[PDB]
Design a protein around this nucleic acid. Sequence first.
DNA 1: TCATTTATCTTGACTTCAAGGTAATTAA
DNA 2: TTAATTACCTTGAAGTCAAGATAAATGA
Lengths: 162, 161
Amino acid sequence: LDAVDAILEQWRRERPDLDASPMGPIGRLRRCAVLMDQRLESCFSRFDLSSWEFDMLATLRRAGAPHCLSPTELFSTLMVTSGTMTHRLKRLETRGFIERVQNELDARSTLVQLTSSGLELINRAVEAHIENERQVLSVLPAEVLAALDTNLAALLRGLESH
Amino acid sequence: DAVDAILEQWRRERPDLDASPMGPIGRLRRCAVLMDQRLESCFSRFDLSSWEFDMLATLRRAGAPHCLSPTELFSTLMVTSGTMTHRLKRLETRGFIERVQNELDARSTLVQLTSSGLELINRAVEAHIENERQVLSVLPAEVLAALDTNLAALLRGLESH
DNA sequence: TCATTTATCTTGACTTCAAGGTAATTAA
DNA sequence: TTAATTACCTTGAAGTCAAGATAAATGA
């Protein structure tokens, strides 16, 4: 049995009038994600990085040289508000990971670009990150990892549709 | 999928790496994020946030008199005690929980559901299930079944370590 | 007793968001 | 030109955590 099976048992005893089967799939998902974050966050700390600081540089890096994106691009992709993004940017700017370049095509726009410092950090952090994930999923058998990828995508399909 | 995009990017920017793991894990992380959004819609109909729901649900599912310890609570909900102290003081102001002094441990102040809280949670969980039932209805039965089975195997490895 | 642990809160700080603000941009 | 919209930041406020503190329970 799994920890989700436990909570279902509790509800099965306390409210037998309900069918809590949906809580099964969804409960496992949230817990998995929660634990998974803990694993990945461990490795990021090895680089003196928090989870969000990594997401920023990975987004800038994966864009492509010159690795320059807009605050709006950033928060639109990272699903955070603008005030959130402002705070993030000022921090990374002080940590010399990003520089601020003024948009020559839109005066209400101040771009964010990777510094040489930041470009090196993320370029090896992405290397560690990948292996960290590879280690985690190695517990699963091939068929299992295969099925999970296929199935989660369908779930993402349905969710993104709505 | 949106994850498919990020994979194409890394395949161009760092072809020296194989980013296959980001696939499964990326979808997982995003799904959880989207799933929370759906659930929070319904919680808002009861004037409740995600954690306020998790709290009363934990107290409710314990069993009458629905009395648990702060340590028990934060241990189950994986949050620090200062988080829990703050949380409890809020719910106490919102008349959902009462504070009972432990007669068996003088360093202990138990947390129990009020008549108010018991009613709110007893119908909120009903809506919550339906919320989830509808969301997952987009998936076929076999697919939802396989996803459940597969997610369970993943939870074993994660919790073991 | 005691030197250590446990239960729980207190403080300072960081991240986040909703709401507002303001300089540019835009289409008529 | 203007009224509406976009880009980005500012400002309170809430939630969270990490140390730290202090009363209470230990087992020797």
